[PDB]
């Protein structure tokens, strides 16, 4: 349902680098815990009051980072490892999750790394990243540091960025050329916006030329964008971008296209 793709609407090139995913016991336990956390109506009412008051002078992500609500799920250990085509007892040095959020997908990627770095723009979620003992970098610090990261993950940040192609070239700058990969994730159909206070959008200053009407057409359009920076798709998968539930729904899902990119 959420993991299927019509590989005939893909070009012959992309049909070969596809990686199929399915529901995992990790996906299962995430959905279970999100449902039972979506059952407590009184706590959601508390959250709703605080949200309404604070939205008048905060961002929705900042609010959900203040309340510990709305954790998300991209892949599971199994899916992540089989997508990166790595072993369970496989370890490298450096990781950089740009726009890490609350760090729960950074948590799922952490065990295979000795140094886990992160960048975030909501200080409330920055505190949660720091409470997970992550080295918080800046929006202009991860690029000009002196290191060359082994794995860079920009999971679900191009929709929410002001200069995504600039970011892609910046990733190309500080990535290890020989065995360094980029884990990227996009919500297709491409919905790009820059957040503001109270859940308001704002258009980006650099818009990506991902022109299509369904998931398959836009993923066919992505190669050119990745080619401008310096990356080529080596593997990619379809996953659900899941989020915990509120008082109206028990779970939320979005259509994600996850790519692994080569320099």
């Amino acid at each position: 349902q959420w993991y299927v793709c019509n590989r005939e609407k893909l070009c012959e090139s992309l049909q070969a680098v596809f990686v199929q995913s399915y529901l995992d016991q990790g996906t299962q336990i995430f959905l279970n815990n999100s449902i039972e956390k979506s059952g407590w109506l009184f706590i959601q009412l508390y959250h709703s009051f605080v949200s309404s008051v604070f939205s008048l002078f905060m961002s929705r992500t900042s609010i959900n980072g203040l309340l510990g609500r709305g954790s998300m799920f991209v892949f599971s250990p199994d899916q992540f490892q089989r997508l990166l085509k790595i072993n369970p007892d496989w370890k490298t040095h450096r990781l950089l999750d740009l726009g890490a959020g609350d760090g729960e997908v950074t948590k799922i990627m952490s065990p295979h790394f000795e140094e886990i770095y992160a960048t975030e723009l909501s200080e409330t979620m920055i505190w949660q990243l720091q409470k997970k003992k992550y080295r918080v970098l800046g929006i202009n610090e991860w690029q000009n540091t002196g290191f060359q990261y082994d794995v860079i993950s920009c999971l679900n940040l191009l929709d929410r960025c002001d200069q995504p192609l600039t970011l892609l070239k910046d990733i190309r700058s500080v990535l290890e050329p020989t065995r360094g990969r980029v884990i990227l994730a996009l919500v297709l159909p491409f919905h790009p916006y820059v957040e503001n206070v109270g859940g308001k959008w704002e258009k980006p200053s650099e818009i990506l030329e991902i022109k299509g009407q369904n998931w398959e057409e836009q993923v066919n359009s992505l190669p050119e964008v990745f080619r401008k920076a310096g990356f080529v798709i080596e593997a990619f998968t379809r996953l659900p971008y899941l989020c915990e539930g509120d008082m109206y729904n028990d779970y939320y899902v979005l259509d994600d296209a996850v790519f692994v990119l080569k320099p």
Partner: peptide, 5 residues
């Protein structure tokens, strides 16, 4: 809702 959006 969804924290992404």
């Amino acid at each position: 809702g969804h924290t992404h959006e």
